[PDB]
Symmetry: D5
Subunit: 56 residues, 10 copies
């Protein structure tokens, strides 16, 4: 799996409360987190399917 | 049905106001609740279809 | 995890070509499969989020 | 619950393969079926949430 | 039409601002209202299609 | 209501099987029909909400 | 085109921040506006496709 | 408006029947067409909102 | 690519927190930003697919 | 970018006609392709946003 899959979720400086998925390396699966709407990091997926396939 | 279907809905510490479904064992059906966006428990479904099938 | 998470994906007798998710116990993650539209088994999720949480 | 909730699912004369929900009075929950796209009966829901609330 | 179709829309105690549909018996059609996310009444539909068919 | 609301649903020459809504003047409400994907007439709505408001 | 297509967008008294489309007669096209969630006027479309066809 | 807004809709060699929008320069608005799923040209929009804004 | 693809993202005067995509000419790809809900500029896409094709 | 981003799109053995995105290394952007519904490879994204961020 890609190295960015090991990064902690990043909400960012923006004010939106949008649900995104990130890979939790410790748990071994993708979980939800609140994304601000801008300046996203690579461990940020709009689709859980994409999260599992890319990082799983 | 799985034991987690008996736990009460858990909103969590996050600030989002997202609608999710949980199985209400008493009522015998799935109902809506507000999910915060993180630290979800197992009785939390994005799709009502999934909620009925998994817990119904 | 629930025992139904161990059953193979079931397309069913119906003629629709709808994408659903099922838990692949060997792979340790949820994958896609084509659902016919009726007579679904429990290892059938409309949302990948629901699949990981329920069976992961 | 409304009397139409006791009707069997009706696919109709049209050629589409769309997933809809109907209340299965015997099973006591909503299930999926393939809707043709036209001439729908009342026990036909686009949302599973609506199906459980209206007929549950 | 079902008796619950005659009830006024109920937002509920929760804080979400989700759009739902309710049947306006006076107007003879379904209209939008803001649902809080929990403790929904029967005259609350996620889909306008479901609202017209159930109450129309 | 607009005059186009009185027109019969028009599927068109294209091959797609997409669900759309049209106003049924006789029934006094919007119903579903299968749209081919091209050369749409005015009594064709992607949203049932839009159909009721425009033609209801 | 219908006369309601000439009305200015109406947000309404409700507290939601939902994106809707309205026909801008001067610009000759549909644009976005923030709908409150209730008491909608006719120049309010959930789908841009519906807006262009109904008012264009 | 961009020059690609003047090109005719292109379905492509693929077998899917997906609805997309294209700008009809003559009609002065965006209309639907069936996209095959691959080798898309620039006058192909997933969202009608994007089509009006980009080409309108 | 169109000249509007070079303009910075514009949130606008409205109060909604909606995610949209804009083309980042320097980065050479589309990124997310928070749109207010009204008075949109041309470098604002509802679909990321549309953003890459139009500006990429 | 990950090595799987260099792989050609893979439709698979299944019979569904679902649109997915894949990274076209030569073009330097994500494009659409038809996915069969099963046995997906890593260069397969449900969201174009995810495709650009993961492979861009």
């Amino acid at each position: 799996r890609p190295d960015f899959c090991l990064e902690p979720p990043y909400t960012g400086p923006c004010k939106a409360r949008i649900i995104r998925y990130f890979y939790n390396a410790k748990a071994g699966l993708c979980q939800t987190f609140v994304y601000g709407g801008c300046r996203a990091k690579r461990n940020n997926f709009k689709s859980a399917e994409d999260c599992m396939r890319t990082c799983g």
